[PDB]
Design an enzyme around this catalytic site. Structure first.
Site, PDB file in Angstrom:
ATOM      1  N   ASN A  49      -7.527   9.201  -5.621  1.00  0.00           N
ATOM      2  CA  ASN A  49      -8.422   8.279  -6.349  1.00  0.00           C
ATOM      3  C   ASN A  49      -9.244   9.000  -7.427  1.00  0.00           C
ATOM      4  O   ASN A  49      -9.408  10.221  -7.377  1.00  0.00           O
ATOM      5  CB  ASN A  49      -9.358   7.557  -5.368  1.00  0.00           C
ATOM      6  CG  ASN A  49      -8.600   6.740  -4.329  1.00  0.00           C
ATOM      7  OD1 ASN A  49      -7.656   6.030  -4.658  1.00  0.00           O
ATOM      8  ND2 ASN A  49      -9.013   6.842  -3.066  1.00  0.00           N
TER       9      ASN A  49
ATOM     10  N   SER B 224     -11.493  11.370  -3.955  1.00  0.00           N
ATOM     11  CA  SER B 224     -10.995  11.025  -2.629  1.00  0.00           C
ATOM     12  C   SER B 224      -9.493  10.743  -2.688  1.00  0.00           C
ATOM     13  O   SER B 224      -8.924  10.593  -3.766  1.00  0.00           O
ATOM     14  CB  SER B 224     -11.736   9.814  -2.071  1.00  0.00           C
ATOM     15  OG  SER B 224     -11.503   8.649  -2.849  1.00  0.00           O
TER      16      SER B 224
ATOM     17  N   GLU C 206       0.829  -1.206   0.000  1.00  0.00           N
ATOM     18  CA  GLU C 206       0.000   0.000   0.000  1.00  0.00           C
ATOM     19  C   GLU C 206       0.861   1.252   0.000  1.00  0.00           C
ATOM     20  O   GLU C 206       0.565   2.189  -0.714  1.00  0.00           O
ATOM     21  CB  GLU C 206      -0.934   0.031   1.214  1.00  0.00           C
ATOM     22  CG  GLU C 206      -2.073  -0.987   1.171  1.00  0.00           C
ATOM     23  CD  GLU C 206      -3.130  -0.688   0.112  1.00  0.00           C
ATOM     24  OE1 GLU C 206      -3.203   0.458  -0.377  1.00  0.00           O
ATOM     25  OE2 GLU C 206      -3.892  -1.611  -0.232  1.00  0.00           O
TER      26      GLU C 206
ATOM     27  N   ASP D 181     -12.420   9.157  -8.038  1.00  0.00           N
ATOM     28  CA  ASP D 181     -13.634   9.816  -7.540  1.00  0.00           C
ATOM     29  C   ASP D 181     -13.361  11.139  -6.799  1.00  0.00           C
ATOM     30  O   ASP D 181     -14.301  11.813  -6.385  1.00  0.00           O
ATOM     31  CB  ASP D 181     -14.455   8.857  -6.649  1.00  0.00           C
ATOM     32  CG  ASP D 181     -13.754   8.503  -5.339  1.00  0.00           C
ATOM     33  OD1 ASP D 181     -12.525   8.673  -5.231  1.00  0.00           O
ATOM     34  OD2 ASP D 181     -14.437   8.049  -4.404  1.00  0.00           O
TER      35      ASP D 181
ATOM     36  N   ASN E  44      -8.748   5.733   3.295  1.00  0.00           N
ATOM     37  CA  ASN E  44      -9.436   6.538   2.279  1.00  0.00           C
ATOM     38  C   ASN E  44     -10.351   7.616   2.878  1.00  0.00           C
ATOM     39  O   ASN E  44     -11.162   7.338   3.768  1.00  0.00           O
ATOM     40  CB  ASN E  44     -10.251   5.584   1.390  1.00  0.00           C
ATOM     41  CG  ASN E  44     -10.879   6.266   0.192  1.00  0.00           C
ATOM     42  OD1 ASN E  44     -11.153   7.452   0.207  1.00  0.00           O
ATOM     43  ND2 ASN E  44     -11.119   5.502  -0.854  1.00  0.00           N
TER      44      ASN E  44
ATOM     45  N   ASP F 123      -6.127   8.592  -0.543  1.00  0.00           N
ATOM     46  CA  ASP F 123      -5.679   7.597   0.437  1.00  0.00           C
ATOM     47  C   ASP F 123      -4.462   8.116   1.198  1.00  0.00           C
ATOM     48  O   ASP F 123      -3.591   8.748   0.616  1.00  0.00           O
ATOM     49  CB  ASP F 123      -5.288   6.296  -0.252  1.00  0.00           C
ATOM     50  CG  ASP F 123      -6.461   5.580  -0.891  1.00  0.00           C
ATOM     51  OD1 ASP F 123      -7.620   6.029  -0.779  1.00  0.00           O
ATOM     52  OD2 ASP F 123      -6.212   4.529  -1.508  1.00  0.00           O
TER      53      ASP F 123
END
Ligand SMILES: [Cl-]
Ligand SMILES: [Cl-]
Ligand code: NA
EC number: 3.2.1.17
Length: 129
Positions: free
Chosen positions: A46, A50, A35, A48, A59, A52
């Site tokens: 991301n 958002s 990750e 959309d 998120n 992380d």
């Protein structure tokens, strides 16, 4: 901060992640590796809108507030910036809530694709707890 592999295992173990919800310590180390590459300061945006955050790439759509993710929730009730600290306590505490929500560690895409069904114990071998 960029953790060493064993250093991180020990930190996660102290914060009660070994066998948390049935997930041995090797799972969590493996997830963090893929990750974040063990980097507490890691961020990724991301599609959309958002983002992380941190060592386990938690998120902002659901779990933390970054003040720029409209219509999102703050389920761990913290600013997303606290997930970037060298102290991992906040990430661990939030991760425990995430992993308890029904889907287990399948919430972490890297875990499902790269750790799930592998010899995860390898990630803690040679470590002094
Ligand atoms: Cl180390
Ligand atoms: Cl949020
Ligand atoms: Na589970």
């Amino acid at each position: 901060k960029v953790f060493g592999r064993c250093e991180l295992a020990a930190a996660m173990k102290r914060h009660g992640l070994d066998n948390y919800r049935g997930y041995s310590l090797g799972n969590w180390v493996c997830a963090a590796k893929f990750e974040s590459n063990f980097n507490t300061q890691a961020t990724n945006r991301n599609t959309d809108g958002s983002t992380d955050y941190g060592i386990l790439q938690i998120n902002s759509r659901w779990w933390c507030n970054d003040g720029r993710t409209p219509g999102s929730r703050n389920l761990c009730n913290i600013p997303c910036s606290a997930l970037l600290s060298s102290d991992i306590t906040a990430s661990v505490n939030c991760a425990k809530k995430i992993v308890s929500d029904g889907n287990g560690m399948n919430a972490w895409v890297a875990w499902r694709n790269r750790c799930k069904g592998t010899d995860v114990q390898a990630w803690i071998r040679g470590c002094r707890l």
